[PDB]
Amino acid sequence: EYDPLKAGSIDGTDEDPHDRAVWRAMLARYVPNKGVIGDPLLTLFVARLNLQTKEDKLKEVFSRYGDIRRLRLVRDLVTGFSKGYAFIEYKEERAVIKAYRDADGLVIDQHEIFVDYELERTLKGWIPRRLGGGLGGKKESGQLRFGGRDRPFRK
Amino acid sequence: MDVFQEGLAMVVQDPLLCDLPIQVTLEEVNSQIALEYGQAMTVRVCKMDGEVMPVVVVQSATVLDLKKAIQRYVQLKQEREGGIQHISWSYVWRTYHLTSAGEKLTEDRKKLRDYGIRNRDEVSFIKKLRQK
RNA sequence: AAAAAGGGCUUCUGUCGUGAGUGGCACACGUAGGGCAAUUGCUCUGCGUGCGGAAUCGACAUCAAGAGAUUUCGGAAGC
RNA sequence: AUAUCCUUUUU
């Protein structure tokens, strides 16, 4: 149950936004893009990939885990730059579940990847970090969001 | 009124003008006439991965005119194939630069000949950074 | 380098749009170039931001494209 | 929770 207010909270007890990027997060409203096609329950969100890994490199590595139906490596539509994340769909529940447990720590290039389900249409209130908020984050810029998988809530 | 479109469509059937994709606009046909006369040249802005689309500018063109050439090209190509129209380039040029073979294009009001780009040459993109 | 005295509160365009908090148009401010008049003033076109700066930490961050945030105080309007 | 508070005066 996503809620941008407690994203900056150490344990969900915050009542005031940690920064302006949470104000931006909750004020703004988000609807999934046009490129979001396929089943959400069977889509894997893989991130932190190297900017120079192509679609086949991911294709073989994540077809190691089962049967793929479609693999998209999100690029910058005007310049080509890979945005360093990719959504992969899996026929049958087996593959996505297996590639959720034994998935973090399968370094593909000189960059270690992160694996989670796609939330978008399954997590109420999800605001991607482009429109403020989001999940994860490096605790060095100043804006991080707890409550996810990389950085859970410190009770 | 749209009486010009009938004459336009009749003209595009000329074999010397079959290259143009119907919707020509006076600027693009002027560019073709110039490249016939030798003061216009094309240039390729290359997507780092995937494809490479070429654009055409005048011999006196500055980085501004290459900027609007990119402005014109991909925008048409969107609904030529059926892509995304409302594309915000207040982002794109705020973050990504233009790169010659080697150097990167920084001074926006300087002609491409000073930066050394010429016909059939290719350019690319950097995320800028490198300070702020 | 150190010492003393200190450091009021809010807000910062409209319009139609949803692959678009990021588009189109309009408006406001800044900038560059051209023309006009009495060292300065007036007008036209493109670009940048939506109030504008400084310091700091990133910009190699988790959602089909979107890198900002903390501290600080200058301007205008109202308390 | 990672990093910087600002003004005036004296020296």
Selected residue of B45, B46, B49 to mutate for chain A interface (largest A Cβ count, 10 A): B49
- Domain limits, chain A: 1-30+128-155, 43-117
Named by the residue before each, gaps in chain A exceeding 2.5 A from C to N are none
Q: Which amino acid is at A46?
A: V
**Cα atoms found within 13 Å of the Cα of residue A15, Cβ hemisphere only:** 0
List the 72-131 stretch of A: residues with Cβ below 8 A of B: 75-82
Strand C atom within 7 Å of A64 CB: no
Interchain CB contact of A33 with B (< 8 Å):
no
Q: What is each CA distance from B68 to A65, A108, B61, B108, in whole angstroms?
A: 46, 39, 10, 12
How many whole angstroms separate alpha carbon B55 and alpha carbon B122? 10
- Helix, strand or coil for residue B30? helix
A43-117 sits in which CATH class? alpha beta
Contact criterion met (CB below 8 Å) for A7 and A133: yes
Selected residue of A56, A57, A74, A79 to mutate for chain B interface (largest B Cβ count, 10 A): A79
Contact criterion met (CB below 8 Å) for B18 and B41: no
A32 torsion bin: left (phi>0), alpha (psi -120 to 50), beta (else):
beta
Domains of chain B: 1-38 (no CATH), 40-132 (3.10.20.90)
DSSP H helices, chain A, are 20-27, 55-63, 93-101
Contact criterion met (CB below 8 Å) for B41 and B59: yes
Q: Can you read off the two tokens belonging to residue A39?
A: 């089943």
Are B127 and A81 in contact (CB < 8 Å)? yes
Residues of chain B contacting residue A80, judged by C-beta atoms under 8 Å apart: 47-50, 125
Reported resolution, Å: 3.4
